[PDB]
Subunit: 101 residues, 2 copies
């Protein structure tokens, strides 16, 4: 959250429907659209490793509905996990955590 | 995720340490800093209802460590929940979901 950046994380939700509604589902990212969205919208995250295996595993990670198309929520939860992991690993070890939660 | 917007959700993590490290913990938002961050960084979300009760409840929601200071992760998980809820309620009813997950 922030200035217009807050509303821009909301725009990241919109980023989803931008790639989703190109092919396959308009509410879910099939591997094809998932690839493009990851490569293009996560240069840092996925651009670190944009291999088919990565997309395949990532899909199975996010796509909890396991239809092999990632929904807005599964998409956002991914980004969620990103900010989380980047954070707790920013300390190197989650010390802000009760280490149980 | 997106263009620089992706890396900007990463900047939202940085948004956190901006407000956190003003007073209290540098890795956790005490009610004071939480208020300012919510009001200022979530005009849409919290600006809809920036009351002390809101902050108090929100804190207890995010602050899972329940020390009454929201950590980066609890902060991001909040934003996560935002994008999630805004999304599943964007349909009005989570139809993209297996309604069980």
């Amino acid at each position: 959250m922030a200035s217009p950046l807050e509303k821009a994380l909301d725009v990241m939700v919109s980023t989803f429907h931008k790639y989703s509604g190109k092919e396959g589902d308009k509410f879910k990212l099939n591997k094809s659209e998932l690839k493009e969205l990851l490569t293009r919208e996560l240069p840092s995250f996925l651009g670190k490793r944009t291999d088919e295996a990565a997309f395949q595993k990532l899909m199975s990670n996010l796509d909890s509905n396991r239809d092999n198309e990632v929904d807005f929520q599964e998409y956002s939860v991914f980004l969620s996990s990103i900010a989380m992991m980047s954070n707790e690993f920013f300390e190197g070890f989650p010390d802000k955590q009760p280490r149980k939660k």
